[PDB]
Ligand binder design. Structure first.
Ligand SMILES: [Cu+2]
Ligand SMILES: [Cu+2]
Ligand SMILES: [Cu+2]
Ligand SMILES: [Cu+2]
Ligand SMILES: [Cu+2]
Ligand SMILES: [Cu+2]
Ligand SMILES: [Zn+2]
Ligand SMILES: [Zn+2]
Ligand SMILES: [Zn+2]
Ligand SMILES: [Zn+2]
Ligand SMILES: [Zn+2]
Ligand SMILES: [Zn+2]
Ligand SMILES: [Zn+2]
Ligand SMILES: [Zn+2]
Ligand SMILES: [Zn+2]
Ligand SMILES: [Zn+2]
Ligand SMILES: [Zn+2]
Ligand SMILES: [Zn+2]
Ligand SMILES: [Zn+2]
Ligand SMILES: [Zn+2]
Ligand SMILES: [Zn+2]
Lengths: 335, 335, 335
């Protein structure tokens, strides 16, 4: 009975970071309390100045990642400020009943609600907005993120041996549907409501104009690249709430991967490229063995390099000649 | 030797039901006899009056599900009435040899044939029409269904423990390619043959005009919703003979899922969203824990809510506050 | 330390064959030496005379398959002749570091380079060209193939029992993006460089004009069909460096399949249709039980029969009435 358990309050952090948490814990079940605020905002998504009339949890794409342990209860307060124009709600794939909670969290601007559910299954799970009659629009405009439920004794390999990560990163991939005018340029809209009709027409073609990680082309590059060091194990959480994608680390691998994202199932090893089904989140572990700049991308290479689905990981440390060596540098063909 | 075994005759039923059968059985191998009749018919597929010049097994999309046990022989009589215009046949993915039987069942209007094959591998398997030179057209126009071959001792979890279902439902998902005229409206054709040329042009774009469950937008809603009750375990068989899809139950899960559809392999647990490869059938078990109306859909949400790939399950019983509770209903933000 | 190991030189062969090799071996680790030469060439890809301005390893699509054992080192000499116009390199998904080797093999026309890497993970892995700023174009124009790394003690089933093949075939599937002129006919270009701008526009639609096995529509049919005999076990290696596909053998199955292509993971059995993620290679074993002509195809049937993704396997031997029998041939419906 959840009424009788201790409560803990957690402060969320912005992607691509994930808020501090324990992996294996000796703690018993808790009611874990979070709050999020919906924000409607126009946002620039590329190098040409194109805008998206966007909708978000907490002002970011994706929304922040929430972490609990199997057997905890999630208790979320969802706030829809009066500065917004539209109604919203939340559907947690990690929850059981009432359309994942959507039926119990319908909030008009100026309102809030509080939901509790038991996190009784381990894995990474998508959450997203789902207002009746308007579901695909709110999701492709930016309203999704991840709930991670860790097993109480931490992650395990197929033989039951312990696995860990030293840091976690959260990547949300967004297929966008931006309309064009008769001059062939992308349209800019003064309000969210004015974008709707034209956007639905693009959506129905099933062809995205852009596909981006974390809100914009190049979001995870330059000063905002992911970082690690040789010897460190990273967890890469990848969510796609609407469309299939195929993650790959250039010069690396997926050492242990749950591509369907559910930790009670055995992971697969040595993957070159994995698969995240539209409407889910998956998770991969990698231990860095070489320093350098890696690319992390969707391996439909058109989707990555032409449409925006790619980022960088900068890795410090010492180069290893045993794994890889330039025997002869580029030079003229001998004659 | 099959000539020496007992014969049983089975009467088929229309989707979404599946004909009565035993799961675990003490019976030895039988020759199991079925018959099906091809029907060409024009059909209304949406709320706007759009028509499809369709082709079916037994007058339904999908065709009926045939159920046997591993080691049985399937013996099918396939009838092509003289009221039809085109030749037809059948390819069983569950069979070995002769293009799945297609080579041995070529029937012109006014003709019939009888095929027998050994069902020597467990799982759910697609069957579909495949006449030489005309294969994709006959499949996307509606000619596919499922053969389920159960292991003789019933379904099993990864550790070999017994699994059961209390009822089975069969869902066939159909990507449709309906042409449009110069006024932008969908075309209506007087004959099946007249639809061919325009339809192939649409097919080659790889973009469906509609994606429907069981023959029409909203087929599995209102009076025709699926039903269950709290405590009941349902088997959801999902077939897609031509295109990938990603099933999801809103407010539920896949407790045990064979997404590739082959029962001798261990299932996965706790899935939010699973994946059915174009040209296959898969199967999921879920035990209901909460009452209410669930949605069952393709989680490319555009494909579901804009193009038609979604249905309803109405579930009776008692609400459970431990799994999910509204702590505070929607109300004004405190000030 | 690789400097101290014996070296072996291997001569490559053209697809769909794979060069001779041992499965289980008693040999210890070797440095295995290969060479490949890039070739830019215009090529006819269909029955209508359409051309592709292509780029290849060794003059073929796909490039040849390279085979080693886990713990061997791959040492490749990559040559870019002065008759070519563009720079090239190589990224091995089987390697660790420096963008899979791409950073260490940048060769302008007139130049060559030599790379060594440790093949420390078993499976089938894609290799492809990846020059900075030009990656998707070089890949969809034909520059990809497979590295197979076999476990030293051969392939194994989920219980650790031994598995073998009697012959191996290598199939590379290529999504092509051929532009059209205002008359609706495919364009023919005098140089590789002149095709670039128009081709990128087609690529961005995500809709291929053609999808072919091994370089052309019908490449693996007639005199060039694959062959086997009843009782023989074949390994079918399938690579797709850019786009998802779903292989199927008509009248057959995948007896044991690694659809993600990594041999240290247990295979699945009895598959009707499997799934190769864009940016990977997978592998299937089948033992023929019936003679005849089988089709091997992508089971999006539009992609197979309309766009080109299909081939033939001709199988000799004795027909087996137990698996399949025509009980009654096509004849008039009794009255
Ligand atoms: Cu919303
Ligand atoms: Cu959802
Ligand atoms: Cu037919
Ligand atoms: Cu088929
Ligand atoms: Cu190149
Ligand atoms: Cu790659
Ligand atoms: Zn309390
Ligand atoms: Zn509290
Ligand atoms: Zn906890
Ligand atoms: Zn560590
Ligand atoms: Zn980059
Ligand atoms: Zn008999
Ligand atoms: Zn009889
Ligand atoms: Zn039986
Ligand atoms: Zn039951
Ligand atoms: Zn509904
Ligand atoms: Zn040496
Ligand atoms: Zn040497
Ligand atoms: Zn070797
Ligand atoms: Zn053999
Ligand atoms: Zn053929």
């Amino acid at each position: 009975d959840a009424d009788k358990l201790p409560h803990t309050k957690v402060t969320l952090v912005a992607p691509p970071q994930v808020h501090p948490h324990e992996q294996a814990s000796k703690t018993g079940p808790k009611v874990v309390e979070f709050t999020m605020t919906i924000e409607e905002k126009k946002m620039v998504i590329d190098d040409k100045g194109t805008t998206l009339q966007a909708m978000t949890f907490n002002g970011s794409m994706p929304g922040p990642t929430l972490v609990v342990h199997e057997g905890d209860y999630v208790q979320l307060t969802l706030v829809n400020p009066a500065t917004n124009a539209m109604p919203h709600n939340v559907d947690f794939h990690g929850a059981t009943g009432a359309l994942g909670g959507a039926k119990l969290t319908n909030v008009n601007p100026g309102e809030q609600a509080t939901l509790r559910f038991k996190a009784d299954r381990s894995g990474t799970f998508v959450y997203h907005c789902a207002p009746e009659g308007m579901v695909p629009w709110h999701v492709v405009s930016g309203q999704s993120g991840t709930l991670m439920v860790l097993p109480r004794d931490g992650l395990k390999d197929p033989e039951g041996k312990p696995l860990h990560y030293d840091r976690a990163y959260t990547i949300g991939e967004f297929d966008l549907y931006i309309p064009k005018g008769p001059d062939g340029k992308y349209k800019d809209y003064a309000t969210l409501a004015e974008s709707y009709g034209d956007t639905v027409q693009v959506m129905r073609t099933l062809t995205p104009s852009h596909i981006v990680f974390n809100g914009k082309v190049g979001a995870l590059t330059g000063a905002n690249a992911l970082t690690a060091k040789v010897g460190e194990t990273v967890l890469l959480i990848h969510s796609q709430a609407n469309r299939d994608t195929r993650p790959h680390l250039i010069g690396g691998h997926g050492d242990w991967v749950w591509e369907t994202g559910k930790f009670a199932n055995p992971p697969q090893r040595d993957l070159e490229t994995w698969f995240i089904r539209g409407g889910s989140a998956g998770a991969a572990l990698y231990t860095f063995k070489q320093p350098g700049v890696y690319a992390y991308l969707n391996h439909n290479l058109i989707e990555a390099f032409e449409l925006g689905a790619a980022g960088h990981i900068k890795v410090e440390g010492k180069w290893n000649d045993d794994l890889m060596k330039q025997i002869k540098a580029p030079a003229p063909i001998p004659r």
